[PDB]
Amino acid sequence: MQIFVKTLTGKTITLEVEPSDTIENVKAKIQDKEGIPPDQQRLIFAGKQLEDGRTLSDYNIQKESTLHLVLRLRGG
């Protein structure tokens, strides 16, 4: 299915993913589309932070879902 991700700049990206895909796989998809490191990518939905070990389906995320992207600063 396809999903949308909005960044802090109000930019929304459309990606192709499945419900069984893990959040870490979604971050890697955004990187290949823009070029940001998956370690600094954060997915937020319905006020809940998605865990790299959890899959989109775990957060009831269905096609055309709108996720939020945040920048993580903890890697030197």
């Binding site: 802090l8 939905f45 006020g47 932070q49 709108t66 939020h68 992207l69 945040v70 993580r72």
Partner: protein, 112 residues
């Protein structure tokens, strides 16, 4: 006789002038505490002085000017973004979480 209260009561416990290491150690600690009670006694007297004795006191030249001039140069410094590297991943997370739950919610909120 023994060593409980005979020749065992002079170990650096006779006088401060008998050692510049103990005389300065007690002088550096006494001055440090004074700075805490001073910066705290000066700021407390100034705050209370601006409520009962608004008249002159010691340093009241730019009171609101320091409040406006400080927020005028800061508030007028790039404000076309909710800041990014100035906060943290959790502060930035609050931004995405604050908008995520504030998208589709027409009846399903946080009721008990």
């Amino acid at each position: 006789h023994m060593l409980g209260l005979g020749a065992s009561d002079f170990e650096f416990g006779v006088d401060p002038s008998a050692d510049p290491e103990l005389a300065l150690a007690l002088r550096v600690s006494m001055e440090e505490q004074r700075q805490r009670q001073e910066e705290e006694a000066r700021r407390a007297a100034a705050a209370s002085a601006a409520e009962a004795g608004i008249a002159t006191t010691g340093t009241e030249d730019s009171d609101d000017a320091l409040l406006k001039m400080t927020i005028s140069q800061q508030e007028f410094g790039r404000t076309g973004l909710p800041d990014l590297s100035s906060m943290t991943e959790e502060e930035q997370i609050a931004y995405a979480m604050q908008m995520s739950l504030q998208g589709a919610e027409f009846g399903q909120a946080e009721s008990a």
